[PDB]
Amino acid sequence: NFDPRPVETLNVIIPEKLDSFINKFAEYTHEKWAFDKIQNNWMYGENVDEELKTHPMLRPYKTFSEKDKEIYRWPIKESLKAMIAWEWTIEKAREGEEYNPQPPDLSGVTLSRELQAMAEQLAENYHNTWGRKKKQELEAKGGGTHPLLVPYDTLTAKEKARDREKAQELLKFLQMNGYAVTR
């Protein structure tokens, strides 16, 4: 049984100051995506094409329209709104330690046990968001089920990994930019 209730973000307001973090982290997430594509021999094209390995978003984040930037900014805003809804504090406590994209490597950033615990809550909320969306999709398309429509805690480690990776990346990037996140 699975009744996912992701945190309701619609009326959560992110403080204006965090817009600098949103834009830097959006840029990073695009750069990481682009890096992997370019490593796999992808190139700029006017259309997405898996045969030719072209993609129109293989160019600098700074050249994007607002709409295209929002592709990366929206999920980050949704993450921060969850954190704010949970009454976590996010404060710039320290100076940050921070077409051929070469994004920062996050593999050397270590989260405290307590930040890892916070990453688990984020990960579960990602799963709940996907899950509630998936139930609506299924019903709109005529029913059926999906094997991952189970509570987060019941997922295997492999099934948890994508959500865990997402949550860690956000917290690591916050830490690298000098933010303390507490509850």
Judged by DSSP in three states, 134 sits in helix
Residues making up the chain, counted from first to last: 183
- Antiparallel, parallel or unpaired: β 89-92 and 179-182: antiparallel
Confirm whether 107 is domain-assigned.
no
Confirm whether 81 is domain-assigned.
yes
- Antiparallel, parallel or unpaired: β 54-55 and 43-44: parallel
CATH code: domain of residue 40:
1.10.490.160
* Domain boundaries, position 51: 1-93+113-183
Confirm whether 99 is domain-assigned.
no
Confirm whether 3 is domain-assigned.
yes
Confirm whether 178 is domain-assigned.
yes
> Chain-centre distance of CA 89, in angstroms?
19
CA distance 137 to 144: 10
CA distance 112 to 166: 17
Confirm whether 108 is domain-assigned.
no
Confirm whether 40 is domain-assigned.
yes
CA distance 57 to 65: 11
Experiment used for this model: X-ray
Judged by DSSP in three states, 74 sits in helix
The two three-digit tokens of residue 130, written as one number: 């996907």
Confirm whether 98 is domain-assigned.
no
CB 81 within 8 A of CB 147: no
- Looking at the structure of the chain, the number of domains it has is 1
CA distance 80 to 90: 9
Q: Bridge-partner residues for 90, per DSSP?
A: 181
Residues 6+ apart with CB under 8 A from 16: none
